[PDB]
């Protein structure tokens, strides 16, 4: 199983296995809430279609594809002992923040992942990246797992809008997974949830397939009552399949 | 230890033996929060009366009481096998909210007790029945338990009003067990649970014994001061209010 | 090791060891935030300059200090087995509540902080102390610890004031430790960064400023210039220092 080069919050790695079993095929696979790949990363489709409401996650991702070799030279020389240090990491932080270059804002941010608080990605109401240090170990250049990001790459387009522009692009051929932010037990609404499953309906009467994931909970039954639902062990896990 | 037909969130089962243990005697126990009924189905009082605020419930009682026959056979109906999936569920819980007839919503309603996710009963803001389909393998009808109610039922009054009117029913002859909404760690507000003790004080004044039961938290020990309390095992607390 | 006269919620009695392992050394020592004075009790300066917000606390203070005799005579008639009832407590809270006597005052205060829920000190919008009977065996009386306290006292002065004006006081020969009310997992966010960035101004007076809180990324945040210390024992405690 290949791994994430980003480290992030709901990274669907622990249940890839679950979601292959019950994920249909087609020629191109639509994911709406990209993040860090992982589903992405562990399929084989002719094609890929990804998106994200996030701007500098998707332009990570387009000058990963792009400038592989220059990108992984630059953000190597970030990842020496020198750096592992609270004071580098707020200087680094600053230059992202004041830096309107998309290439080394783009170095910047894989450093911000792999050395602050969780591998979280946060922002205040100014727009400003405002995750702390994380007080690490000793932090792991993810060379492989980059290479194998961009390799898998030219097979993608890549682009930064929200869950119903992204599914409008999905067609005949195409299969959508969709891995919204979490159901509670700013950010997305839920008006969104509920719009998302609606959406879905629209699909699967076209004959385009649609997978969920979500936590189980009253909310999530009720938004996905016209899927088939299976449930998943770890709270619960739910797993909805909209199957024309 | 008799059990009710209804699953529903509260409900006293875990707690009877001290609930017992604690509440007086006399001709009739008021119950003004009384869901699904365990104390009423389990005690001997030689009258009830029973109030909720929930008038789904009460209306769903009071047919219990009334045409007993009727409605078992016409709820044991919604129970085969060609009723257990999710279509039917969410074409059932349509008909119910678009019904205007009192018995077909109450024979509805038993369908959704005991089909809808953790037994749940909750209300969007339109008013109408919102709890999701519970996906459960083989459902219990529960057949004992309604007749069981029915006979328990020839001595009761029920009620749909809120606690305040209810409360006032009670005489010199009365019990009264409060089992209100919990106290936290359009929902029953903490006005509403300080007016519940207020009103308690002033009935163990005119001489008729009140106990109540609720969370034990820094809020219900100030509420229930002027009870007796005792701490039963989150710990669960009793207010007895002996004249 | 000594006790506190008081319970008091987040009393630092668990946490000595690693306080005092990071509390530099100095002829003064302000504590802002004193609440029921454990690092006080516990320590060996020359001097103290003692605050909190409370003005029933410091009063007591001033009481326990000025009047030690006449105040322990007379607390100790409170702690017999006839006022270890409701009925009792709820007078004397009534009395408590309703009395303009800075002695009598000081007097109830000590028996409805150790007859009362949790040892709990709360307060309404009318201002009148709210917590209610806490049923306990038998309540203990803190004779020793009362003399204790006030022989330690007479090397201290005790302000009513808020963390601003009471750090203001420190001088070279000073050393701050600052307790605040706990971050989230009433005492506001903007308050809580208001003070690592006073302490930010007196480290470069050449004052050192120790920070005891919750770990969690909002302290990261605000204590970002500050040597961090990760404590055990429940959620993970911080402690901050800064350092000349
Ligand atoms: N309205 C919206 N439209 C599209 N993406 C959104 C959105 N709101 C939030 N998001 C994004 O949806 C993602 C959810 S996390 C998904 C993780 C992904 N399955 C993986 O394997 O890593 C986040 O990246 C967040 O940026
Ligand atoms: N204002 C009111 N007056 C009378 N009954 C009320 C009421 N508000 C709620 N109820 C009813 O009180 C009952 C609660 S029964 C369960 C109580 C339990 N401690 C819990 O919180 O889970 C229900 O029947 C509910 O419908
Ligand atoms: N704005 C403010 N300024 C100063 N003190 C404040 C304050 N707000 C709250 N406090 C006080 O800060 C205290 C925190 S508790 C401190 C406990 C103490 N360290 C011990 O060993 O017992 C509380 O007593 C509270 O009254």
Redesign the pocket.
Known sequence: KNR?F?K??????PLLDDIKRHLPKGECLV??????????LNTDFSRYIL????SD?ISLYNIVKMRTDEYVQAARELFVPETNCAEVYYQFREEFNKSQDPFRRAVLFLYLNRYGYNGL?RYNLRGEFNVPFGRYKKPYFPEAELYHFAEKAQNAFFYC???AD?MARADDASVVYC???YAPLN??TLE?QAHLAEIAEGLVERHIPVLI?NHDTMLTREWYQRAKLHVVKVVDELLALYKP
Request: net charge negative; aromatic share 18%; charged share 15%.
């Open positions: 994430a980003l992030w919050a709901g990274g669907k790695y994911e709406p809430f990209v993040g860090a790949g992982s589903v992405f998106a994200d409401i996030n996650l990605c809008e929200s869950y992204s891995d919204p932010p950010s997305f969104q994931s």
